[PDB]
Design a protein around this ligand. Structure first.
Ligand SMILES: CCCCCCCC/C=C\CCCCCCCC(=O)O[C@@H](COC(=O)CCCCCCCCCCCCCCC)COP(=O)([O-])OCC[N+](C)(C)C
Ligand SMILES: CCCCCCCC/C=C\CCCCCCCC(=O)O[C@@H](COC(=O)CCCCCCCCCCCCCCC)COP(=O)([O-])OCC[N+](C)(C)C
Ligand SMILES: *[C@@H]1O[C@H](CO)[C@@H](O)[C@H](O)[C@H]1NC(C)=O
Ligand SMILES: *[C@@H]1O[C@H](CO)[C@@H](O)[C@H](O)[C@H]1NC(C)=O
Ligand SMILES: *[C@@H]1O[C@H](CO)[C@@H](O)[C@H](O)[C@H]1NC(C)=O
Ligand SMILES: *[C@@H]1O[C@H](CO)[C@@H](O)[C@H](O)[C@H]1NC(C)=O
Ligand SMILES: *[C@@H]1O[C@H](CO)[C@@H](O)[C@H](O)[C@H]1NC(C)=O
Ligand SMILES: *[C@@H]1O[C@H](CO)[C@@H](O)[C@H](O)[C@H]1NC(C)=O
Lengths: 148, 142, 197, 649, 128, 117, 98, 292
């Protein structure tokens, strides 16, 4: 084959001198021919602290309207999301406090989900969960009993 | 001396004439401060096709203004019955007579009110009449 | 415990078939209902004003491709032209949950291969009030709960993709004026020398 | 759950005794009146179709055969005169309407081929001849065609059932054998293509090996209608007990009241008596107790209160109840030495007794709403019994240790009870239910539940389940029970009670109660809650378990739980109510041997192991096909809308 | 590929036969309990079906081959990869090897095509 | 009266373990007092008797594997008229001897039926 | 590094196909073998991560960094709960069907 | 699996619109391969890809003077979709344009744009119908490049962020000596599509042409910008032949030589492109390397 047309016109430096210019009188031109740090700090403070309100009393009343029963998988799955999402999601001297506050209140939302799962009874704390793996008192151990 | 309790379970009055008489029994159990060793217990069946049962020769407490009570259990393996139990008062009056009264009661309620208070039980005439012989319906359709 | 095999063959596969068919139906209904796209059907002048807003936004996002002598001119022209000129998915889940608890309630369907705690006996066994049944022997709503979590591989494998104006323009011009130009053409030579050598 | 199972899942062998006297009905002439089953205090009077072979009704009358006679002025009415107290009753013969009765004056009353036949019965000149063929067999012939065809047949060998028994009826070469066998099976399936089976699987198919009072052995098929598979006359007097020899259920040992044991090999078709040897001291056998099935010895108790350790082909404690007291015995090496006696005084009488049934352990305790365990008192070797005191008129529930024999729990009921009514104890895994009759709250029937726990405070297990500890209950060093009691009323008088036995004892134990009118109901143990708070206090406080039933101390008679639906079932006075564990955990066979063997299958927790007969398969396939049709019809609409999104937008 | 569909069907047959054999064994064990666990030929057949299914999944990946857009001969361009490279330096190597331009709907001007000029050039090429 | 508790072997005679005193309603209940205990070495399986010489004889009420530190509790089950119905021997870890306790039988439950209001 | 997002989405789609088929058939085999709880979950962890290692060796050709940005987060994570729920579903299906 | 290779080849010619720049021999081979493929299996080819390939087949048949077969293809696409999408409007405009009727196509597109002003659909429809109207006004009226530039500038005044319009404007500006306006339009395309390495290469080429046309002290000042844009074109594409050729040529023209660490890298990358890339890239890279 023959090579590209952009490169036949690129090697010869005399072609660009041969390349003339058209007259431009009525030729149309194309169309068109610190506070940033403080606002960045406020945007990052809303990124780390204004996400906290969702984790606040709105979410507390949202988990208080589920009544603490195991009979649906939507409260259990949303409590698992409240457990795992904060777990998955966990001028320089001003944003470190909000960066610590964000993960602290994500841990607070994780504790809210833990409180929901514990008020459901879905956490193996008491002896009713470890009752099937609890052994038997062997009473006889060398005698037999038969009755009339 | 000895009282007699009449009665009538009207089965021909509801077109249930085809039935076995031995599937319906009537038990009588004495309560209310008797004077024998054991309280009097009897069990009778029907006497006619009309349904008129009868208890007879019941021992009574002999004395003026003295009562002797009997719980009557009309039971049937065929039909439900509307008075589950019937209290029977057999008061020996000074009138020279022997007043027989009967009071309706359902299963699971006491027969005499507490001495502190009172709600009375619905009085039954006299034969008596266990009404509502609708069938017992053992079988559950599925 | 001797269970009925016909309980398996008539509860496990029908609940799974009905759940994959209602997942298919929910995907098809949510494609047919959501007719909107990334664009909308607007008149031409609203599209032109949104195109100038998005031109200022694209200049903000892609000023790194230009030099300073061109980004400054485009920023000046853009400033001069800007200043002057949720329950739809839980209703099928409720319908399928009611249909499982209506058609298949009253019998233990199967045994789990993993034991849970006794509190799951209050959710995985419904029509059985027996207290000595440990939480392995489960009803059909347990298979609903297990299939709800685990049908996303089956949804993927069958090919389903598994379940006013002037204020905004002046705000975009104010976000454009305060930007710091950080072009990607300054030290592109040392970056090419680091990448390919 | 019941209407498609009535007269199908259950059956009744409606038996009379040997027909002592047969009286023709003058009002019908197609009916007949049979006196039968002559006991020393009662007699079964029945009306019976001589043309159909079915009993029209039965009545156990308190008068004997000699006392029951026929009225002289009315031959369609029988007068029954108890002459020891001059109590007479006149009964109609057609519908058994009780006519006149009294104590004073009784009315003037009168007095009443086949293969080796022995007697005639009901010689009626138009039709309906009855041949008493064998000693306990009655055939019935009619003459529709003047040829005397056999119309009905009846075998009254089963009268007074004593005992029973239930017969249940290198690697590459293996891989290539499996592959070739499955290949040949698939070939035969694709070449062939181009209840009575599930009852064997579910354990419903069983054989009752009923032993009667006359010395007969039967073979009543459970999944049939009680069809006698085989029968055997042992030619003994008053057979007493019957046990299997080995674990494979191939041979029985039937003991008799004369001191003879018989080993009977039971085949699939018909059994043969294999041994008829006597005992060592054969005077009169009272009851036999089987000890330690793997080492086949027995504890034959005699009528003279003697004992005999018997054997055919460390400590062993045996408790034995009587009408006056409960006694203990130890078997040291081969001797039977008595160990304790909880005897009663002259005014008391042991009226009920039940050993603790060896149930399979599933849960060690009861999980409450706080997930706090109330541990069951699962100590074995318990026995519960009732002592009726006529001096104080009390019911004394006692719970004994049966190894040392100490009374763990005592309970007095001064409810003015009646001892002329039936009283029964049944013992569950950790609980006792006893029924008696009294009149102090109300004059109806009382049912008391005693649930035994290790402690009444939750999460307080008092038993030592450690590996380095072994309990020795002969020392007495066992934990003591703490009980919770409730009393329930019940409208019908309960004659006897039993516990429903299932396979692994998973489902809820139903206290199956046979009532005095012949009906059999059952109350689940969930409905008899001993830690029951009433429905006011049940909803407020949360310490109850999941769906814990409240304390309902009334117990209305649920007609869905009457398992003798519309049947004229008549068990006698012995009338043992037995339960048989099958496979398929949810169900249990309830039989009621003793005058009429009735057998049914109950599901106390519902039939959760088996698919319902009215399972909506049609609506299931309709919903599946509707979803398939809706997807197949809405798929081109989506395939067109995505194309319109690709092109128009 | 062909080996992928072959191992897919072979693993499906082996897993179905081994599941049917394990069903027969575990439903004969339930009738014999009214100890003696799975015979190792069924276990090794389930493992053979699992290994053949894993090989059918991994041999479904064919190495990425492309035809060149301009030239039409017996040459096929392959970088020897099973997946597509994410780095834009190496992602556009596919577009540069075959002769395409990913922003060709902008670069080639497909809206401003003089249709009569294309028809004239094609007609003069067919006439010659 | 006086309850003599005495263990015994199979065929041989009784060996006394103690004597206790039943007193009928001095001021309260009929609860026992211990007159005499017996410091006799006893070990093995024995039949215990609880003979009262005036009112009630019990040939053997319990069969226990007795040890020499007899940490038992003589439960005297009594009646409404304060007569000795039964005698039993419970185990008690914190007992150090055989102390006798009178047990009155528990009042059985009564059902709350509907009343007449 | 400037990524081409179509190649990222396509590589994640192929990896999701591998992980979905592997999780479902591992659940079917764990149900055919009648594996109980801890042995079943350890079985799934071992064989699922072995399939991911075979994906890195055979498909990614010992360099998953040119095919997945953050390959440890993309291959071994980001579908772990999804594949373990698919394994539990196919595990219960096969365990109940056998 | 040759059918999948032909499918992906036809989808890349469809999506990148390479048939616009094809030879009549290449259009003949494309029509033959397209009619062989589209009269075959159709298993992995989706429905939308099938109708996009049929639109591409329509344009190949239109370019190859096969207007009857193109009318058949447009009739099939109208029987599926109808004359409601923008693409079917452009196809109807081409069918009006090739059957005489150039003023009829102008009237149709102008009256549709008078319908497509108020209560319109999305911006792609208006900008595509208006770009086709500019193309038909260029062909029929025989417009000069100033008037075509006036129409494209009017279509960028209203409706910006259509990089096709700015690219066509830069093409006409580069056909003239107006290199600064061309560079402004190319920088606008870089604002729209940021990873357009072909646009970085075209901007480097326009700055190199302006630097050689200047021939002054500003020549090196423009060659600096040309080298930086050519280096950005190869930081977005390793095997970009135009970018590495421009890096080599602008580095030789800037003053640095004798393997001054970038001419060496550009020569190595052009040798790699001549080694592994296609025959057009190989011949072009041997043309770039073997000069002087
Ligand atoms: C359960 C999920 C529901 C929602 C939970 C919400 C509440 C959290 C509470 C959760 C309580 C979990 C049960 C407690 C276990 C006690 C039993 C025991 O002693 O050990 C048992 C093993 O342990 C297991 O088998 C755990 C079972 C987890 C099943 C996960 C199914 C969900 C699908 C996948 C989900 C991700 C699974 C991730 C796994 C890596 C066996 O012991 P043994 O041999 O019999 O002696
Ligand atoms: C006793 C029972 C025995 C069963 C034995 C079955 C053994 C399983 C073996 C199955 C082998 C599959 C045979 C397909 C034949 C080849 C077709 C093909 O081209 O493959 C294509 C797709 O390939 C797939 O889709 C694989 C799907 C695996 C599903 C695993 C079953 C999970 C069942 C449990 C789910 C619970 C229920 C969920 C709700 C229903 C290739 O696609 P690509 O081009 O590479 O991209
Ligand atoms: C108790 O007896 C008296 C007479 O002595 C009687 O009046 C009273 O009615 C009796 N009690 C009851 C509840 O009947
Ligand atoms: C009649 O009855 C009342 C109360 O029931 C009693 O006080 C009175 O003495 C009675 N009369 C006679 C004459 O006994
Ligand atoms: C008895 O009382 C009734 C009504 O209470 C009355 O009619 C009757 O006359 C009384 N008897 C006598 C003998 O007066
Ligand atoms: C006759 O009556 C007495 C008491 O009424 C009873 O004890 C006896 O048993 C009766 N006789 C018969 C034969 O039943
Ligand atoms: C059975 O008895 C009923 C009523 O007594 C009668 O109608 C029926 O005909 C009898 N059966 C036969 C076969 O005669
Ligand atoms: C009577 O009994 C004998 C057994 O000795 C049996 O063979 C015969 O068949 C019986 N008679 C009838 C009619 O069944």
């Amino acid at each position: 084959q023959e090579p590209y047309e952009w490169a036949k016109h690129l090697l010869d430096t005399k072609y660009i001198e041969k390349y003339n210019i058209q007259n431009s009188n009525t030729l149309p031109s194309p169309p068109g021919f610190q506070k940033n740090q403080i606002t960045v700090l406020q945007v990052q403070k809303a990124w780390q602290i204004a996400l906290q309100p969702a984790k606040s009393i709105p979410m507390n009343i949202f988990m208080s309207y589920m009544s603490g029963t195991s009979l649906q998988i939507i409260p259990i799955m949303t409590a698992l999301m409240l457990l795992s999402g904060p777990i998955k999601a966990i001028t320089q001297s001003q944003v470190q406090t909000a960066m610590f506050m964000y993960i602290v209140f994500q841990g607070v939302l994780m504790y809210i989900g833990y409180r929901k799962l514990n008020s459901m009874g879905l956490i193996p704390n008491a002896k009713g969960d470890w009752l099937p793996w609890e052994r038997i008192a062997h009473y006889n151990n060398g005698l037999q009993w038969f009755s009339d | 001396r000895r009282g007699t309790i009449k009665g009538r379970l009207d089965l021909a009055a509801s077109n249930i004439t085809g039935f076995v008489s031995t599937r319906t029994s009537f038990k009588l159990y004495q309560i209310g401060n008797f004077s024998t060793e054991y309280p009097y217990t009897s069990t009778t069946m029907f006497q006619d096709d009309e349904g008129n049962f009868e208890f007879a020769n019941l021992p009574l407490n002999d004395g003026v203004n003295e009562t002797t009570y009997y719980v009557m259990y009309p039971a049937s393996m065929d039909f439900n019955l509307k008075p589950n139990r019937i209290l029977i008062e057999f008061k020996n009056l000074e009138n020279g007579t022997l007043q027989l009264n009967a009071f309706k009661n359902f299963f699971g309620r006491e027969y005499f009110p507490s001495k502190d208070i009172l709600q009375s039980m619905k009085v039954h005439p006299y034969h008596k009449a266990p009404i509502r012989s609708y069938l017992q319906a053992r079988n559950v359709s599925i | 415990m001797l269970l009925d095999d016909q309980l398996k063959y008539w509860v496990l596969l029908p609940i799974s078939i009905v759940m994959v068919l209602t997942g298919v139906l929910k995907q098809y209904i949510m494609t047919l209902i959501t007719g909107s796209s990334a664009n909308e059907a607007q008149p031409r002048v609203k599209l032109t004003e949104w195109q100038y807003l998005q031109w200022a936004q694209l200049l903000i996002g892609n000023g790194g491709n230009l030099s300073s002598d061109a980004f400054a001119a485009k920023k000046e022209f853009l400033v001069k032209d800007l200043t002057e000129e949720n329950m739809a998915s839980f209703i099928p889940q409720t319908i399928i949950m009611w249909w499982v608890n209506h058609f298949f309630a009253g019998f233990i369907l199967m045994q789990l291969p993993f034991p849970l705690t006794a509190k799951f006996k209050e959710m995985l066994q419904t029509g059985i009030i027996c207290q000595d049944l440990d939480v392995r022997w489960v009803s059909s709503i347990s298979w609903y709960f297990i299939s709800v979590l685990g049908l996303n591989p089956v949804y993927n494998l069958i090919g389903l993709n598994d379940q006013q104006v002037d204020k905004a323009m002046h705000a975009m011009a104010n976000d454009l004026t305060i930007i710091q130009h950080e072009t990607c053409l300054d030290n592109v030579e040392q970056r090419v020398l680091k990448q390919y050598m | 759950v019941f209407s498609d199972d009535a007269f199908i899942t259950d059956w009744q062998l409606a038996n009379l005794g040997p027909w002592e006297k047969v009286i023709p009905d003058s009002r019908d002439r197609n009916r007949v009146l049979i006196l039968s089953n002559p006991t020393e205090t009662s007699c079964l009077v029945s009306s019976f179709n001589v043309s159909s072979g079915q009993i029209l009704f039965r009545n156990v009358l308190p008068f004997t055969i000699d006392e029951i006679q026929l009225d002289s002025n009315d031959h369609n009415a029988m007068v029954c005169v108890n002459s020891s107290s001059n109590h007479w009753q006149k009964y109609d013969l057609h519908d058994w309407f009780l006519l006149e009765e009294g104590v004073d004056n009784a009315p003037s009353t009168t007095i009443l081929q086949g293969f080796n036949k022995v007697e005639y019965f009901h010689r009626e000149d138009p039709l309906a001849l009855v041949l008493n063929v064998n000693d306990t067999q009655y055939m019935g012939f009619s003459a529709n065609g003047t040829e005397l065809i056999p119309v009905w047949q009846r075998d009254e060998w089963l009268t007074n059932v004593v005992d029973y028994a239930v017969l249940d009826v290198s690697l590459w070469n293996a891989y290539w054998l499996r592959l070739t066998t499955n290949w040949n099976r698939l070939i035969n399936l694709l070449k062939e293509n181009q209840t009575t089976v599930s009852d064997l699987k579910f354990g419903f198919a069983k054989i009752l090996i009923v032993l009667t009072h006359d010395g007969f052995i039967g073979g009543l098929d459970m999944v049939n209608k009680g069809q006698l598979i085989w029968k055997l006359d042992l030619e003994i007097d008053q057979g007493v007990k019957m046990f299997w020899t080995d674990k494979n259920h191939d041979e029985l040992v039937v003991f008799s009241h004369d001191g003879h044991y018989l080993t009977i090999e039971v085949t699939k078709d018909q059994p043969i008596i294999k041994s008829r040897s006597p005992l060592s001291e054969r005077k009169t056998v009272d009851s036999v107790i089987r000890l330690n099935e793997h080492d086949h010895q027995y504890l034959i108790k005699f009528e003279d209160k003697d004992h005999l350790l018997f054997k055919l082909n460390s400590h062993i404690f045996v408790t034995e109840h009587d009408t006056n007291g409960i006694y203990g015995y130890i078997i040291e090496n081969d001797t039977v030495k008595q160990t304790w006696k909880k005897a009663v005084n002259s005014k008391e009488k042991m009226v009920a007794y039940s050993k603790r049934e060896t149930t399979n352990l599933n849960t060690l305790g009861i999980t409450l709403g706080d997930k706090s365990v109330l541990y069951k008192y699962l100590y074995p070797n318990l026995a519960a019994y009732l002592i009726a005191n006529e001096e104080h008129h009390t019911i004394t529930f006692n719970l004994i240790d049966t190894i040392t024999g100490e009374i763990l729990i005592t309970q007095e009921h001064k409810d003015s009870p009646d001892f002329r009514f039936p009283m029964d104890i049944v013992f569950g895994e950790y609980w006792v239910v006893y029924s008696y009759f009294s009149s102090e709250p109300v004059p109806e029937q009382k049912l008391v539940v005693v649930e035994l726990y290790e402690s009444l405070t939750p999460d307080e297990r008092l038993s030592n389940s450690s590996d380095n500890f072994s309990y020795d209950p002969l020392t007495g060093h066992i934990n003591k029970p703490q009980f919770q009691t409730k009393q329930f009323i019940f409208p019908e008088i309960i004659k006897t009670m039993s516990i429903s036995k299932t396979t692994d004892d998973i489902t809820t134990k139903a206290i199956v109660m046979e009532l005095e009118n012949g009906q059999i109901t059952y109350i689940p143990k969930l409905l008899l809650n001993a830690r029951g708070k009433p429905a006011e206090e049940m909803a407020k406080d949360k310490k109850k378990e999941f769906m814990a039933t409240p304390y309902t101390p009334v117990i209305p008679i649920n007609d869905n739980f009457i398992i003798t639906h519309f049947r004229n079932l008549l068990p006698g006075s012995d009338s043992q109510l037995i339960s048989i564990p099958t496979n398929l955990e949810s169900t249990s066979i309830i039989c009621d041997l003793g005058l009429d063997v009735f057998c049914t299958r109950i599901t106390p927790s519902g039939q959760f192991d088996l698919m319902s007969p009215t399972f909506e398969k049609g609506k299931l396939l309709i919903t599946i096909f509707v979803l398939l049709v809706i997807t197949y019809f809405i798929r081109p609409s989506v395939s067109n809308k995505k194309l319109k999104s690709q092109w128009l937008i | 590929s062909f080996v992928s569909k072959l191992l897919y069907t072979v693993s499906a047959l082996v897993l179905f036969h081994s599941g049917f054999s394990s069903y027969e064994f575990h439903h004969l064990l339930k009738l014999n309990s009214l100890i003696s666990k799975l015979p190792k030929d069924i276990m090794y057949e389930t493992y053979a079906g699992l290994i053949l299914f894993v090989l059918a999944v991994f041999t479904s990946f064919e190495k990425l081959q492309y035809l060149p857009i301009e030239s039409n001969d017996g040459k096929i361009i392959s970088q020897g990869n099973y997946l597509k490279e994410i780095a834009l330096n190496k992602a556009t190597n596919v577009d540069n090897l075959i002769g395409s331009n990913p922003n060709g709907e902008i670069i080639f001007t497909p809206s401003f095509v003089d249709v009569h000029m294309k028809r004239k050039i094609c007609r003069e090429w067919a006439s010659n | 009266d006086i309850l003599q508790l005495s263990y015994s072997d199979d065929a041989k005679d009784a060996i006394p373990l103690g004597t206790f005193e039943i007193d009928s309603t001095s001021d309260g209940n009929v609860t026992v007092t211990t007159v005499n205990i017996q410091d006799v070495e006893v070990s093995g399986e024995y039949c215990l008797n609880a003979q009262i010489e005036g009112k009630l004889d019990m040939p053997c009420f319990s069969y226990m594997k007795l040890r020499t530190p007899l940490k038992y509790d003589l439960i005297v089950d009594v009646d409404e008229d304060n007569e000795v119905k039964q005698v039993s021997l419970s185990y008690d870890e914190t007992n150090d001897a055989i102390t006798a306790t009178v047990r009155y039988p528990e009042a059985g439950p009564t059902a709350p039926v509907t009343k007449l209001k | 590094q400037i990524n081409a997002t179509a190649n990222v989405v396509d590589n994640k789609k192929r990896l999701l196909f591998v992980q979905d088929s592997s999780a479902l058939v591992l659940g079917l085999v764990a149900g055919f073998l009648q594996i109980e709880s801890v042995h079943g979950f350890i079985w799934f962890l071992i064989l699922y991560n072995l399939i991911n290692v075979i994906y890195i060796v055979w498909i990614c050709q010992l360099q998953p960094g040119k095919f997945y940005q953050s390959p440890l987060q993309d291959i071994f994570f980001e579908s772990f709960f999804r594949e373990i729920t698919g394994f539990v579903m196919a595990w219960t299906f096969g365990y109940a069907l056998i | 699996m040759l059918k999948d290779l032909v499918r992906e080849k036809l989808l890349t010619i469809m999506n990148t619109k390479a048939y616009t720049q094809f030879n009549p021999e290449q259009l003949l081979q494309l029509e033959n391969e397209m009619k062989i493929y589209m009269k075959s299996g159709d298993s992995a080819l989706t429905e939308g890809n099938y109708f996009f390939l049929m639109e591409m087949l329509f344009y190949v048949l239109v370019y190859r003077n096969q207007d009857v077969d193109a009318q058949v293809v447009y009739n099939t696409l109208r029987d599926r979709l109808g004359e409601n999408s923008y693409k079917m409007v452009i196809m109807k405009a081409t069918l009006l344009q090739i059957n005489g009727n150039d003023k009829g196509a102008i009237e149709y597109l102008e009256n549709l744009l008078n319908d497509d002003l108020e209560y319109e659909t999305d911006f792609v429809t208006y900008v595509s119908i208006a770009k086709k109207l500019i193309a038909i006004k260029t062909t029929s009226k025989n417009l000069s490049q100033e008037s075509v530039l006036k129409e494209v500038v009017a279509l960028t005044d209203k409706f910006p962020l259509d990089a096709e319009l700015w690219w066509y404007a830069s093409e006409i500006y580069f056909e003239m000596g107006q290199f600064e306006k061309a560079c402004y339009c190319l920088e606008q395309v870089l604002c729209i599509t940021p990873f357009n390495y072909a646009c970085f290469g075209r901007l480097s080429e326009t700055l190199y042409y302006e630097a050689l046309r200047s021939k002054k002290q500003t020549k090196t000042e423009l060659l600096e910008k040309a080298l930086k844009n050519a280096l950005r074109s190869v930081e977005l594409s390793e095997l970009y032949l135009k970018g590495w050729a421009l890096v080599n040529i602008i580095s030789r023209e800037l003053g640095r030589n004798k393997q001054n660490d970038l001419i060496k890298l550009s020569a190595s990358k052009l040798k790699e492109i001549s080694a592994k890339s296609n025959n057009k890239d190989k011949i072009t890279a041997e043309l770039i390397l073997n000069k002087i």
